[model samples]
Target chain A: HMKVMFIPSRAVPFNPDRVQGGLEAVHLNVLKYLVSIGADIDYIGFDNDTFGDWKVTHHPVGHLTKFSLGMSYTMARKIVELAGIHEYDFVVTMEPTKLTVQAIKDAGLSKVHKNFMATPFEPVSRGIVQIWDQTIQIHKNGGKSYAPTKAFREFERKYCHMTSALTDKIDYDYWRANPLFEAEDYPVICLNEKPEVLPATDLIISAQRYDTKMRRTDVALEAIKALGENGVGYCPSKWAPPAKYPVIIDAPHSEIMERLKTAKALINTCPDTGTVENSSIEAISKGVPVIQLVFKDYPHATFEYDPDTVRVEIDFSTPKKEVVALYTKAVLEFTDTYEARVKRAEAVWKKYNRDAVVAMWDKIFTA
Target chain B: HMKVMFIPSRAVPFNPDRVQGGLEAVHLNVLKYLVSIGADIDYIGFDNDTFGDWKVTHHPVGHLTKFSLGMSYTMARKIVELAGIHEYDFVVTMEPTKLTVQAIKDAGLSKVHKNFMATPFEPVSRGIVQIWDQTIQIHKNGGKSYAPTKAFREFERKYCHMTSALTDKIDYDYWRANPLFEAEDYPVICLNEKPEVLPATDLIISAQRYDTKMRRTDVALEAIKALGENGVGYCPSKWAPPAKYPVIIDAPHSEIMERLKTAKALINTCPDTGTVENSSIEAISKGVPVIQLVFKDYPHATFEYDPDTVRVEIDFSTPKKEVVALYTKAVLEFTDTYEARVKRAEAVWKKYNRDAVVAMWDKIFTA
Candidate 1:
């Protein structure tokens, strides 16, 4: 068995004590698939007591502020200490940048066996956000202009080329065309299982970090408003745009499935990350239709976009009057027959069955 | 909408940063249901960034260690401070032990407007475990024996009566009679969705915290062994009994549903807490039969206990050979017909549907 150390950009408690956000969510799915396939896994990040069974070991670094100057030093020290004690066959860093890349070198590790994991555009903005925060911190500390500029230079030097290099490890073109990842060197697998089909209520759902620059929450709101009587209820995520419509907010993370089971469809605005949203995958897997909005005249894209699946495509630039008309038409046409929706949902299930996904990961880990 | 404050016995980050265990899991479900129904909610616990949406306000208490003497002081101070700022309609604590109950009383809050939530015997052991740890700490710290003894006395005085008092607000008898909770006073809800039925993969799954006293990991291992050629695979949870069987350990939490879908049946050893095991509910919900090892001649039990539901009742004092024989017989009989297993599982789903469960809580909050 290969000894693997999986590192993430930030800490993940991976137990009931902590809540999971975006990056942790992706990392968890990846780790679970790896473990199921008999890979000896060690998770090194975050400060917390050891959790999980013997198959996985959690090494927490005492609570250090994420992205702080001390973070890189602390992470590197821990990584070096772990490498000194145990021989790891591979170091899988989820979204590695200069901080982690340099840390690996400092730990006397080979970059040849290193695997970088990133989710398309998501990491680009995340890296920039880190730099922006660092700049503000430097300014508050009354550092010289060279300080923030040097920080930016280092980030660009490590991450810009690193991002380009990481893309070459996978078939970036194939991913752009397909809804899911099909890398030449590393196959990113999703859960392969039957889509959950349950009794549907007249509820439409959409969620994204509201602060995201490119999220068109307005389009979803306009579409919902246009649908009028067809939309009986809506559940807006915390960062979702505010609307006059009745919204169900602060639903526990576990209960998202329960809410989706009752919903008619999920109205998803385009995310800047340009990859398929996990929420959309969840909605599709639950046999809920996804009404995804694309920018005006932009080519439709997703992780594993199946044209026949119960998805309604909306153009963001469409006028309010037409947006309503188009959304209402789609909802009425889709809900007109239950058999059609079920058939489409089944297609999604056939593509992503859990065992198939796990097998794919097994091949990747063993290879 | 009623203003609500949820205080768990321990810290619940309720994010991807950590995993929720024990009281936090139950507390999270309750909070989710309350949020769904639009009760204005406040979650006050250990320190973490705010999670969820506008409907829920997160009041972090700067990461206090659960069950510590300092924890009570910190929680009491926070509760009093919160009560001072807002007129709360209800204060819901996961389990009202001496620490939290006394904290509330110390905060000068009225017990009439308080709700204590618990899961079967789970909380009983949890509280006892805390006290045991406390006793050890007292000895190590050079405190007098009287110090720890005094703590235990207060814990029993408050909780022994507190557990009984909390029952009055819910249908305790219904939970005892059924495998799940069903309270007229307070809705005891379970996941009502259909289980993902998949092609059988020659696998039988069983899991429980092996370290837990009441869990019968032995019964499951023995049963797997008895099945012999019929079993090609096993998914043993972290604390399961040692076995020569092929085991999938440390699988991702999300993949449990997928694992159950491929298994012919789940081998459930009775849990000491007497609360319905989450795994059993998960298995039943996924249309997999549960070959549960209930004590022979035990009282009439759990959410529709039909003989066809694949239960293997064994006496605690039964010989090992007899136990294996009983388990073997149950599995062979249960898997004999796919139609029968589905029928039994469907019956479970009806009894624990999501809407009915959520409504139960609605009545509790309003009442």
Candidate 2:
């Protein structure tokens, strides 16, 4: 018998019933891959307490519950109680950026295999606000921060640990600056592979809840508008397609590859996004260059990185102290030249092919 | 080994040491009592996940841990899980009331306990506010009430429940109008005994953290000064000197008997107090005439009708109303003569005593 635990931050009757962002989409894709590999898996996660084929548990409790931080360690503890300590063969911890991600598999949700998923965006500023917003509110009404423990206050003085409040910049700084490393005990399969390319629909912008203020997409749209009336326009959807992008619909992987051969340049316009999405990766793998549009300065562009695998030649490495403004340069450059977009895309495609990226994960997970 | 659990709202070694209005006094008092009784009780509550003496556990996995009305239920459940499922002889659920004379011993803390505290202040606007402020804050934002739970929202809708934001009125109504007897399960012990001479140094007053737009103690101080200059002073110190009035140190029954020997008159200033406190019951138990000082118009200064032990006064007879001025007639009568205060205190003392009150506890716990 196989045990599977599916976890989502939002307690669900699965909203939209499909994955959206790269973090979610890539995680689900890996789960599908795990299913393909015939691994016995059961899921326990942040969802409505309604029991189903997948055991959905609430977010772990702790100081996080006191503040509105989603998916607390209390949530992790619940999964630990249900799947980890109780019994499970493999535990797949999704959404690596979420609280207690490691705690779930560590405390005992699975024995043989454990995994964590993150979009490239996690290491950057674009995703900072959501994590901060969720955590800061906990401190607003004099509430405590989400501690790794419920007894954090006992040693609070010794640790010099302070909780974050929405208005408190001090807490926000502490969380952002303090890097948390995963424990070396578990074999973690980090999924960074590209998904099959779907019909590039309308403006497919991946807007996050916090980045509305950043307006990174505005630069991309402005660049596209500069192409004149006949130029390419973003999908009118104002959001990622209601379904998972690049969903591999019933076709063989080879067939999907053939389809990419005839396609025009793929557009990667998620400007505020820090995630290295599968879309850029897949198109490059098939030798289809992308429009290399970015709202942030591309550091890899100056590193002499391969175009096909890396997918861009634009500069994120300018070392501009005011980085937010500097990143918009790539967006402007891409809209101005089809040739420039094609060239950068080609460079990335050669280096970051499906084999290279997935194999990197396999090496990491196995070693 | 006889098992017991001393349950409070928060964790041990809590920083800041106190949440103003200091429920911790009752918490400390109960812990003292537990020590007195030689009960190796488990103390369960909220904190940064510290465990040991408390066996501190968070609410359940799903809707319970969410920031909503279910938080109190979540807390009560921790008690239930530890005491009921794990098998404890008794669980003491102390209410944040009568700070100095608080007592609680219940098998499971539940909505019934909430209603028990709500009954005595029936028809008194201040009493209703107190119950809402105390019972609902665990989930709601501080001083702001909101229930995110579908079940709790549904129940609130079904019951046609009311909510208010005028903080002081709520506190006063809680103390004066709400009937603790509305809680059907509690055996109304010493149903008729009331106090003849309270051991209070001054008429105690409480205000919200924001009422004075400063420290709540400021408001408390002002209220004390308004009551009287000489016999009136605030003393929350546990080390404060004994009362000049007839003070009930341990056995209130014997103390009242000593006071009644030569006392010819008595007064009860808590015409507004709901849940007949030990002071109220003690005075009423003694067959002495009484003068009640009421702020708002609440019916029943009766010795017989209010002493009814069977009927739980669930629905308040007090109309939906607000009173701006205190009932000057009641206050003027009591303050006019020391003879009036002596008479009422004597009468109220008879209504509350050890035998009558302890009997109610025996019946409720046994049942």
Candidate 3:
């Protein structure tokens, strides 16, 4: 067992309703994994934001506000105060170019912990600079930072220290594998006392926030529209769109998995995206097939192609006609059957499960 | 200037004469390079030996002894005492195992420095285990250790932290490049009143210690015996072998370089060798050719085969007839002219010079 002080992004939500595994979701999963491994953790976060029922020693740093100056400065001071008494095996802080690092330096609160690490990476897909603009500083002795992807690791190496890639772990039990014949036809003709009906074998589901252009919201809508009324969308927040289909918004991860039970296939918003994105993996591990876009100049590993697992990876440059053709192939030709879905869910179990990912973290934390 | 606390091996002799680069040679070169970059280094060595006259503030630790208990424990106690008074930007120690790390742990002398790094590498060439056998331990938080080669780096990674390779820098001016027809003849064909003559264009030189089997003392003797009395040898210590040729032993680096001015070629003892061995590189940079043996299953970068630089490479598995045939060709055909020697010396200057490698160190030290 080890002691860790974790400073995570604001994505650790009170209630992760309709949340696709992004910063917030992964942070939550990592916390859960740490607890399972019997690690003594100090969960440091901004006050006013509830951690919902996380099993860890919670220590609120500062009150949250949209004001960057107030938030960054107040938290910086709070960390300096916390640094005086507490020691740890690993101290993970984020936002390298912030007043927080400067505050620590000013107070000489360094070398108290062994692995003083930070994650200073901005996603190319997000079109955002994760670093603060004002007087930003980094702990010069910070051993190494963590990256969610190898590409991110490279970026950290260029501007930061040597890095290690710590990709988000997907919870196997939470997103239970979709059974062979069970969810293929929901609102099944046999069993129903108090029942709800949404995801059916013909419906394609797309889950993401619609606020960013990188999400390719239009692409998801266009491809699904080409598939007719058999399309569904999920947004943790609001998405203003016109489509004659059901939309599941502001629901928990459990409810989305419930919908995935009957989903025909998951339609990816960003084509050839993350090394491993939560929404795509969550759906894939749930035994639902995913329709992904493959770029001509593919830089990294995207959604893997396996027809046996019902992955319909189409070329990003493939005209809209072919995109629809591939999407149709995924939902119609491959994933309609129960056997294809069962194999799809089982193949991803060994690779992306919580146990495997936690073991990797255990090495990073202890070894 | 950075403050560095360096714990080097006991090879930093009162005099570096006929020494081939190994743990001792590399450690010395790294220190000199660090000083050239204006770094404030605290060279911590055993109290009994003298460091000659290097430009850095020195701090003597334990006294020298053959007994492991006396040397290790005294050094461990000394480091713990020093740890109380000094903090540093980088703290570099060798021999990860023994009572030293334990003493530091007991005194809670960790995290006081930024980069707490240790190199735990044992050469496959040497049968000796570089690590102590009694009880091995490593600083759990030591940032990253240095390796003279990438192969050693991989070994560190398997049992250590994510690492960065830091090879030794060579001083260029010290082994000044030989001019065409400059030292081609006598002590000088015309200028010397106090005349001396040894290294003529026909003589081949071999430099290394005779203590280790990996040094291949017999191979050097065998190869040079075939080359006849025109071959010369350098041994930093005594070698009990019968050879009629004049051997230069117990001489300084300056004396060795002085002789290299007129040597025709240097024959390698270990045909397949280091990433960058000092004697070979020193000779090459000083306009002398080198004859190297290429093993069948060659793994890493050895004496690079550059005919333009007069590198004579022969197959290790080649018949002795062909081996002699090739070694004979190097002295007879390629390196008989001063014009050829000029080209040989000029080519290696850019890559292996002191300044270039020091700048690399500067990046590691500062960036």
Candidate 4:
């Protein structure tokens, strides 16, 4: 009967559809499970952006943006004061966001709470927070911002508390916005999670290229331009009906099937690319499937067809004529009966429903 | 061959016959011996204090008074800048005036010249300076200014170099002050001369009811009062004679000799009672002993029989009398010649010299 507080990773009234973005997807899934099991959770949100959590307390401080060693102390003191003593059994924060909390916890008077998070650290729960943060920031932003804030020190002041982190190597110098300069006198734990132990998540989401639709357009344009600029030979008949100026054909069919079989998915544009831009439904028609695709202008996580799932923006940067033609063609193909589509959708969701996901969480929480 | 330095415990003008009152006697005896053995000896005087080839430096900073901990550093840095860290095999200093040099050594930037008169502790050094000044004011009508001076701190910070101290339990408390507070991270060496290794030093110099000369009118008054009012019939006339009265010879000569022979030594009037009535010397003359006898208003490392050595004050209200008459009488009675007097004085000195008791510093220093 331990109480745990949770700090969500991003700005919110979380766009449920944005969950399909892999990173955000795991967040919603975990939170949903936490809620279902009656885990006492604290969703500490640090943003004032329109997308914010409406269900929990939103604590904000002006000094959080100053980004200095002094700020670390200020934040730690605030959390300690607000939480009070004996309030929570432990705290479970998301990675990246949890590094700060863990550093503070290492210094603070830790009585009842244990710190846990998904870290880039091996050994699962113990690694250098600043180092991990640097790796993430660097890998995400490219190698830059060297000599970043080096004054902010992070150290384990007490031994009862533990920290976990993932390191690719002992000497990989990750770029830190602020490298903690002071000497730290604490032991670190590294948890190595190899691919063999990859959890069987209900949905295994890999990050597709950002703005998949726009990237698709750019790729298509680049391909056509390359063809025109450096064509050893060009064909005109393939372009007859669809006016396809560029065509790319290859036979990596087995590789495509293996990728499509594991509920892995993507979001992009169509017409020029022929087969459905988001072929996740094609996978759904098969036994293994992925869901939650966007087809119109909506916040990033919207799912258009299902009430039970979230929908995101997709399918619509067309003119009035293109929309009319596409809809008419689709209606004619379906023969005007939507029952089949509904039944197929239900069948697709049957295996990955809330009950299954909730059970997984119950097992995790209990374990 | 190594070199060394010898400093007179106090800074006093040199006099051939009264050389014990200044560094001259120390130079002639200890320093000369150290040199004879091929030790490059430097006899520090008012003009010798510097960071050159000589092992000793005794230059005095004039009229400078009062400094803070920070000021100590600045002053030390300045001296370090001037001295430029070159010569001097090692530095040796003595108490009361050499505290700053010790502090500089404590900062770990330069070499230390430690003094040995009082405990060589930062606080003891500090306390000794304070006590010396307070004693000077009490004996002389000078102001009782005991605040740490800028000059002293400057000297301490710059030349203190890094060093330990000669102290014991009785003086251990002093270390808690200077060594702990003043240190950045320098090591401190506590010499076996540690105060606790020995008992607290007795400050008494003369005893009442003894030594006709030390028993001035005022001291006699207090002693006589104690005898009559307190009915303490233990006052010995040979040691503490009444100023207005002569000894009544009611006892036999054999009885007197037996009493004198059995007696351990002469003592001082309690500082509370103010009666030195100087019996300490008379006892020494009689093959007895004494501790802390200041015959000429100061401590001298050597003793030479001179009528002037008796010049001291004994008035209850600041008596300007030759207090050394007792010592002069003892010397005259003990050997009857200046050479004999000096020889005996040297004999007594060997018993108390620092080297007489110091063990090889290697045991602790090497560690």
Q: State model 4's lDDT.
A: 0.32
Clashing pairs in 3: A11-A24, A18-A251
Interface RMSD of each: 17.7, 19.4, 28.2, 29.8
Error of 1 at B92 (Å): 0.9
Residues A22-62, candidate 3: write the lDDT tens digits.
44554545555555444677766666656444456766655
Error of 2 at A248 (Å): 25
Chain A of candidate 4: what's the TM-score?
A: 0.37
Model 2 residue runs over 4 Å out of place are A1-16, A33-42, A47-89, A95-113, A119-216, A235-263, A266-274, A278-288, A293-367, B1-367
Q: Estimate, for each residue in B50-149, the C-alpha lDDT of model 2 and write its tens digit.
A: 3334322333322323234344555445554554566655555444322201222233333123211222212235644554445433212111122211
On TM-score, the candidate that comes out on top is: 1
Candidate 3 local lDDT, B1-367, one digit each (tens) = 6777666664333233424434555555556656666777776665444445556665654333322343455567766776677666665554444465566555454443222222333333121232422112332433333445443333333333212222122112221231101111010001112222233477778776653344455556556666677766777645645445346667776788788878887766454444444566566666676666445434322334234433445454566666655655654453456665566565555444455565445555542
TM-score of each: 0.41, 0.34, 0.39, 0.24
What is candidate 3's DockQ? 0.00
Q: Is the docking of candidate 2 incorrect, acceptable, medium or high quality?
A: incorrect
At residue B63, candidate 1 shows an lDDT of: 64
Q: In order, what lDDT does every prediction score?
A: 0.52, 0.35, 0.49, 0.32
TM-score of chain A of each: 0.67, 0.47, 0.68, 0.37
